[PDB]
């Protein structure tokens, strides 16, 4: 209810939203059915089109016109965008050579370059190249400004999660918009595209850019447009606000285009009907730039051209049906499509069982086009678990596919040829980024990056301090000519101890046994290895900093260095370099079940073999792999109890293959590698290092905590003609966070040889170094010759394993 009796005279696209029941004249009024009676007439004028003509030139103003071609239009700020071109012999912005914008070239009384954020729904990354012929305005922004070959969306790659990630710099799990569709069990409410509930404020967490701006005294232009306001009118309105007096003019503006997503759904990402929507978007950008140029603002404003996700080929026939797997189909609720989320239809049904549902959904058909997960077992890179709105059971759907509950759903609810929502590493889900203006670099291509990063940069562009977020601030400094953010390294909280030899062998009663009984040339030599004489070789980038309060030791050895935790009874990290020439050897049998006391570490701070013997499910592995020891004598070090970690037999198959085969392979392909491995404990799946009291599982009868995951960080020279250990320039990294699981149900091929499936598993759980920092509270690459910004970029890098 509004007294829709009031008027919109001199209120058209008012910047503050007014309190019902007085009627509203803002760009959002329709979506709340609250516009004044006269809104359409006053604010949505259409008369005479969107363009001047030779004969409308110098005309007498007629207020009914959509836009003006009279002399005064300029001062008034309401000409058609093509006025100067038609009436004053000016050229279109697209037809001008580009010229470096070294400084903001702004009208007097602008305190900062304005930022215009132009967002295009479903604009797949490859459109920049594949549609380059029909998008000349966008092509000029791209090639003249700063661009990435693509931008990585967040999962799920849907419109609401991604737009709200752009606004906030947060993962969906933190900002709370975890899908286009959602059930919040605490509110007992549902969120849907259709309806009122989505307008309620309790859905939207974090602090979006417009709120950050207001709180800090930067005026923001209402970001949101009622769907039936046509594009031309959005543009003109923005150009209007830009002519406002200094004290009322917004500094930041948003345009949203429903295209090309809307057509891409109907016709597929590359349907022949896709050319026109791309031409129309380019024309809109052309109108913006021509209008900016008319106001002499085209070398003053920073423009960001950004998509929320791409678009994949998806059809009705590529549907998997849960009713083909589950006998109990009507006792579950499915959130369907390009992802699945399952819960109990009724939480009074105590006979519902997630374990049995997971099992009936696992590896059932030879080419199953979805894989079920407990949310906490999803790839950590997705950051999709720590929200009560995310169901315990998740289905990751193959690209090109849909999951539905029953066939009735798919034909009693083909229509569509395109969809999106899949895993965010999927090529067809990648979207765009272009930045153009005084603050962005000129003719510069930057590497791909993730959209969680942009919030920080839009804050930089506006001189705002960002609210706490998931971007890594400074990792996108290389996009910017100035306004860079110069972060310092987090300070180390705990300093390590460096223990010497303090214990006698016979003080250890651990049930551990080792067959190990054997000069001065090589007795001084082992001692210097233990003092750290090869640390320079195996610790290339400094030791990681521990960013929390704890008690740990640095342990030096011939082949590897480790930071051993006295609290968790194992290393936090283990570091070693494997050169291109290194050789794999086997574990001798006088050594197979050997575990040796470490005479630098008390019995009390050590694991014991007995607990592994008692624990019928749990076994153990090693962080530094004995396969890769440098000499028979060094190989004993690999068997120290301080190199030992708890491992399920199922997981050891994974680990042994990685250590025995893949590490050498990466050293061959990359010209040496540096490896840092270690355990992760994330029992509450928040993406953050657990404290000791969060640990849910210990090796039977002991205090040895069981990791949920195992990481490795594999670094080399980007220029691979130099060995990892003598690298003159930038670095190259890949990492993983492997789930530590008692079975291999995740890999449907796992009863075959590891060469068939282990590597694919690792690819799926590829990670950013930054993900591993959050999960461990360590800070890596402390001592390089590289700039800190270049290091933040490296730490945010993700090796996706998709082709070109």
Ligand X SMILES: *[C@@H]1O[C@H](CO)[C@@H](O[C@@H]2O[C@H](CO)[C@@H](O[C@@H]3O[C@H](CO[C@H]4O[C@H](CO)[C@@H](O)[C@H](O[C@H]5O[C@H](CO)[C@@H](O)[C@H](O)[C@@H]5O[C@H]5O[C@H](CO)[C@@H](O)[C@H](O)[C@@H]5O)[C@@H]4O)[C@@H](O)[C@H](O[C@H]4O[C@H](CO)[C@@H](O)[C@H](O)[C@@H]4O[C@H]4O[C@H](CO)[C@@H](O)[C@H](O)[C@@H]4O)[C@@H]3O)[C@H](O)[C@H]2NC(C)=O)[C@H](O)[C@H]1NC(C)=O
Ligand Y SMILES: O=C(c1cc(OCC2CCOCC2)nc(C2CC2)c1)N1CC[C@@H]2CN(C(=O)N3CCc4c(O)noc4C3)C[C@@H]2CC1
**Residue 181 binds which entry of ligand Y, K ion, Cl ion, none, CB below 5-8 Å type-dependent:** Cl ion
Our CB check for Na ion shows the closer of 378 and 480 to be 378
Q: With CB under 5 A as the contact rule, which of the stretches 84-92, 104-112, 599-607, 679-687 interacts with Ca ion?
A: 679-687
Identify which of residues 314 and 794 has a Cβ nearer to Zn ion in the complex: 314
Residue 98 in tokens: 């580009």
- Binding of residue 688 to Ca ion (CB under 5 A): yes
SS3 content of the chain, % helix, strand, coil (to 5): 30, 20, 50
What character string, x for contact with Zn ion (CB under 5 A) and - otherwise, covers 226-265?
Answer: -----------------------------------x----
Q: Does 180 appear as a known binding residue? A: yes
Four-CA torsion 141, 144, 150, 151, nearest 10 degrees = -70
Q: What would the two tokens of residue 732 be?
A: 């190259």
User: Which of ligand X, K ion, Cl ion, none binds 176 (CB below 5-8 Å, type-dependent)?
Assistant: ligand X
Strand partners, 337: 403
Q: Annotated binding residue at 309?
A: yes
Contact 386, 686 (CB under 8 A): yes
Question: Which residue's CB is nearer to Na ion, number 604 or number 742?
Answer: 742
Q: How far is the CB of 22 from ligand Y (least distance, A)?
A: 23
Angle in degrees, 0-180, between the axes of helices 136-144 and 275-294, rounded to the nearest 10 = 60
Q: Is 482 annotated as a binding residue?
A: no
Q: How far is the CB of 382 from Na ion (least distance, A)?
A: 21
Q: Is residue 66 within 8 Å of 45, Cβ to Cβ?
A: yes
- Compute how many other C-beta atoms are within 10 angstroms of the C-beta atom of residue 737: 24
Beta-bridge partner residues of 676 = 575, 713
CA separation (Å) from 578 to 72, 525, 584, 668?
73, 20, 10, 9
Separation between Cα atoms, residue 332 and residue 340, nearest integer Å: 12
283-312: which residues touch ligand Y (CB under 6 A)? 306
CB of 381 to Zn ion, least distance (A): 23
What the block records as the tokens of 323 is 């009713």
Per-residue buried b or exposed e for 614-648, using 16+ beta carbons within 10 Å of the residue's own CB: ebeebbbbbbbbbbbbbeeebbbbbbbbbbbbbbb
Name which of Na ion, ligand Y, ligand X, none residue 254 binds, using a CB cut-off of 5 to 8 Å depending on partner kind. ligand Y
Tell me if 686 is assigned to a ligand binding site.
yes
Residue reference for tokens 């070294």 = 102
Residue count (the chain):
804
Residues 168 to 187 in contact with ligand Y, rule: CB under 6 A? 180
User: Is there a binding annotation on residue 799?
Assistant: no
The token duo for 696 is 């849910």
Shortest Å distance, C-beta 236 to ligand Y: 17
Structure token pair of residue 492: 């180390």
Q: Which residues ranging from 744 to 803 are in contact with Na ion (CB under 5 A)?
A: 744, 747, 750
Q: What's the min distance (Å) between Cβ of 800 and Ca ion?
A: 25
Pairing of strands 370-374, 393-397: antiparallel
Give phi and psi for 571, each to the nearest 5.
Answer: -70, 145
Q: How far is the CB of 339 from Cl ion (least distance, A)?
A: 6
Q: Which does 158 bind (CB under 5 to 8 A by kind): Na ion, K ion, ligand Y, none?
A: ligand Y
> Closest by alpha carbon to 13, among 24, 4, 3, 1?
24
Q: Is 709 annotated as a binding residue?
A: no
Shortest Cβ contact with ligand Y: which residue?
159
Tokens of 278: 């791309």
Window 431 to 460, contacts with ligand Y (CB under 6 A)? none
φ/ψ region of 263 (left if φ > 0, alpha if ψ in -120 to 50, else beta) reads: alpha
Nearer to K ion, 323 or 619 (CB): 619
The only residue of 135, 144, 151, 209 in contact with ligand Y, by rule CB under 6 A: 209
What is the size of the binding site for Ca ion (CB under 5 A)? 5
Q: How many CB atoms lie within 10 A of CB 5?
A: 10
Least CB distance to Na ion at residue 500 (A): 46
CB of 177 to ligand Y, least distance (A): 7
Is 175 one of the annotated binding-site residues?
no
The partner in contact with residue 530, picked from Ca ion, Na ion, K ion, none with C-beta cut-offs of 5 to 8 angstroms by kind, is none
Short-list 336, 333, 305, CA closest to 419? 336
Q: How crowded is the C-beta side of 32, counted as CA atoms within 13 Å?
A: 23
Work out which of 690, 754, 773, 790 binds Ca ion, going by CB under 5 A.
690
Distance CA 550, CA 682 (A): 17
How many residues touch Cl ion (CB under 5 A)? 3
Cα dihedral sign for 761, 762, 763, 769? positive
User: Which H/E stretch holds residue 165?
Assistant: helix 159-168
Considering CB distances under 5 to 8 angstroms, the limit depending on partner class, which of K ion, Ca ion, Zn ion, none binds residue 308?
A: none
Residue closer to ligand X, measured from CB, 162 or 534: 162
Do the beta carbons of residue 320 and residue 402 sit within 8 Å? yes
Helix (H, G, I), strand (E, B) or coil at 224: coil
From the CB of 319, what's the least distance to Na ion, in Å? 25
Alpha-carbon torsion, ordered 191, 196, 200, 205, to 10 deg: 40
- In terms of CB distance, is 157 or 800 closer to Cl ion? 157
Minimum distance of ligand Y from residue 107's CB (angstroms): 25
Closest CA to 709 of 775, 653, 781: 775
Report whether 121 belongs to an annotated binding site. Answer: yes
Part of the chain binding Ca ion (CB under 5 A), chosen from 63-71, 222-230, 331-339, 687-695: 687-695
Residue 261 contact among Zn ion, Na ion, K ion, none, beta carbon within 5 to 8 Å by kind:
Zn ion
Catalytic residues: 159
Chain position whose Cβ is nearest to ligand X: 205
Which helix (H) or strand (E) segment is 615 a member of? none
Asked whether residue 26 is marked as a ligand-binding residue, the answer is no
Kindly state the greatest CA–CA separation across the chain: 105
Residue 383 interacting entry, from ligand Y, ligand X, Zn ion, none, C-beta within 5 to 8 Å by type: ligand X
Determine if residue 308 is labeled as part of a ligand binding site: yes
**Hey, which residues between 226 and 255 contact ligand Y (CB under 6 A)?**
227, 254
To the question of whether residue 749 is assigned a binding role by annotation, the answer is no
Candidates 601, 595, 310, 579; CA nearest to 427 is 310
- 284 belongs to an annotated ligand binding site: no
Per-residue exposure over 495-505, b if at least 16 CB sit within 10 Å of its own CB, e if not:
ebeebeeebee
Q: Give the nearest distance from C-beta 419 to Cl ion in angstroms.
A: 11
Q: Does 261 bind ligand Y (CB under 6 A)?
A: yes
* Residue 477 interacts with which of Zn ion, ligand Y, ligand X, none, CB < 5 to 8 Å by class: none
Strands 151-152 and 449-450: parallel
Which CB sits closer to ligand Y, 261 or 771? 261
Residues 162-191 that bind Cl ion (CB under 5 A): 179-181
Of 167 and 727, CB closest to ligand Y: 167
Site membership for Cl ion, residue 438 (CB under 5 A): no
Is 319 one of the annotated binding-site residues?
no
Binding region for Na ion (CB under 5 A): 744, 747, 750
Binding site residue list for 1-hexadecanoyl-sn-glycero-3-phosphate: 159, 180, 261, 420
Binding region for Cl ion (CB under 5 A): 179-181
Binding region for ligand Y (CB under 6 A): 117, 119, 158-160, 163-164, 166-167, 180, 193, 209, 223-225, 227, 254, 256, 258, 261, 306
Binding site residue list for 1-tetradecanoyl-sn-glycerol 3-phosphate: 159, 180, 261, 420
Binding region for Ca ion (CB under 5 A): 682, 684, 686, 688, 690
Binding site residue list for Zn(2+): 121, 159, 261, 265, 308-309, 420
Binding site residue list for Ca(2+): 682, 684, 686, 688, 690
């Amino acid at each position: 209810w509004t007294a829709t009796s009031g008027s919109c005279k001199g209120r058209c696209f008012e910047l503050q939203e007014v309190g019902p029941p007085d009627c509203r004249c803002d760009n959002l009024c329709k979506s709340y059915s609250s516009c004044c009676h006269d809104f359409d007439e006053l604010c949505l004028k259409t008369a005479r089109g969107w363009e001047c003509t030779k004969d409308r030139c110098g005309e007498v103003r007629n207020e009914e016109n959509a836009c003006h071609c009279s002399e005064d239009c300029l001062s008034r700020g309401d000409c058609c965008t093509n006025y100067q071109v038609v009436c004053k012999g000016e050229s279109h912005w697209v037809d001008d050579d580009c010229e470096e914008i070294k400084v903001p070239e702004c009208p007097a009384g602008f305190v900062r370059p304005p930022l215009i954020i132009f967002s295009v729904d479903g604009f797949r990354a490859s459109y920049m190249k594949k549609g380059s012929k029909v998008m000349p305005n966008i092509e000029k922004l791209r090639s003249c400004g700063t661009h990435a070959p693509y931008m990585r969306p967040v999962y799920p790659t849907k419109t609401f999660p991604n737009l709200y990630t752009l606004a906030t710099g947060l993962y969906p799990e933190s900002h709370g918009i975890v899908g286009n569709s959602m059930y919040d069990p605490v509110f007992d409410a549902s969120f849907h595209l259709r309806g009122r509930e989505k307008f309620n404020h309790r859905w939207w967490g974090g602090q979006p850019l417009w709120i950050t701006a207001t709180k800090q005294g930067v005026r923001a232009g209402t970001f949101f447009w009622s769907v039936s306001i046509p594009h031309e009118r959005r543009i003109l309105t923005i150009l209007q606000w830009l002519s406002l007096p200094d004290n009322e003019r917004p500094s930041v503006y948003a345009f949203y285009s429903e295209q090309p997503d809307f057509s891409g759904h109907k016709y597929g990402p590359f349907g022949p009907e896709m050319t026109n929507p791309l031409r129309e978007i380019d024309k809109t950008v052309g109108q913006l730039m021509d209008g900016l140029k008319q106001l002499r603002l085209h070398r003053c404003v920073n423009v960001i051209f950004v998509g929320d996700h791409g678009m994949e080929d998806v059809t009705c026939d590529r549907t998997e049906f849960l009713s083909n797997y589950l006998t109990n189909v009507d006792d579950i609720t499915l959130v369907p499509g390009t992802l699945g989320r399952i819960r109990a239809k009724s939480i009074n049904n105590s006979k519902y069982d997630p374990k049995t549902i997971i099992a009936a959904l696992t590896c059932k058909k030879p080419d199953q086009h979805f894989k079920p997960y407990m949310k906490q077992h999803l790839p950590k890179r997705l950051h999709y678990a720590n929200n009560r709105r995310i169901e315990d059971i998740h289905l990751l759907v193959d690209r090109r596919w849909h999951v539905a509950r029953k066939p009735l759903d798919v034909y009693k609810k083909c229509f569509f040829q395109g969809d999106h929502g899949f895993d965010n590493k999927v090529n067809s889900m990648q979207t765009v980024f272009v930045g153009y203006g005084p603050t962005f670099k000129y003719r510069t291509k930057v590497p791909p990056f993730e959209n969680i990063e942009l919030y920080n940069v839009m804050c930089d562009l506006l001189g705002l301090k960002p609210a706490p977020n998931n971007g890594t601030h400074g990792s996108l400094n290389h996009l910017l000519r100035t306004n860079t953010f110069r972060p310092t390294m987090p300070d180390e909280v705990s300093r390590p101890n460096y223990p010497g030899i303090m214990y006698l062998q016979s003080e250890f009663d651990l049930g551990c046994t080792c067959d190990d009984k054997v000069n001065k040339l090589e007795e001084l030599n082992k001692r210097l290895h233990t003092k750290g004489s090869t640390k320079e070789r195996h610790l290339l980038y400094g030791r990681p900093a521990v960013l929390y309060r704890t008690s740990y030791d640095i342990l030096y050895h011939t082949d590897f260095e480790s930071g051993y935790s006295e609290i968790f009874l194992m290393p936090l990290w283990t570091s070693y370099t494997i050169s291109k020439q290194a050789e794999v050897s086997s574990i001798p049998e006088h050594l197979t079940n050997c575990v040796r006391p470490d005479v630098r570490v008390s019995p009390g701070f050590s694991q014991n073999c007995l607990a592994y013997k008692n624990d019928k499910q749990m076994s153990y592995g090693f962080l530094f792999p004995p396969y890769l020891s440098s000499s028979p004598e060094a190989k004993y070090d690999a068997f120290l109890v301080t190199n030992m970690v708890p491992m399920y037999p199922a997981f050891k198959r994974v680990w042994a293959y990685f250590q025995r085969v893949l590490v050498k392979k990466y050293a061959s392909e990359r010209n040496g590698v540096n490896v840092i491995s270690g355990p992760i404990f994330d029992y509450n799946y928040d993406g953050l290092r657990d404290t000791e009291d969060e640990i849910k599982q210990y090796v039977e009868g002991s205090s040895i905590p069981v990791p949920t995951h195992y990481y490795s960080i594999i670094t080399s020279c980007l220029d691979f003609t130099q060995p990892a250990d003598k690298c003159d320039g930038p670095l190259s990294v890949s990492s993983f966070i492997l789930p530590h699981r008692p079975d291999n149900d995740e890999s449907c091929n796992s009863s075959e040889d590891e060469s068939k499936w282990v590597e694919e598993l690792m690819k799926m759980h590829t990670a950013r170094v930054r993900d591993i920092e959050h999960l461990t509270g360590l800070d890596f690459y402390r001592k390089t010759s590289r700039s800190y910004s270049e290091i933040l970029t490296l730490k945010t890098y993700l090796h996706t394993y998709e082709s070109e």
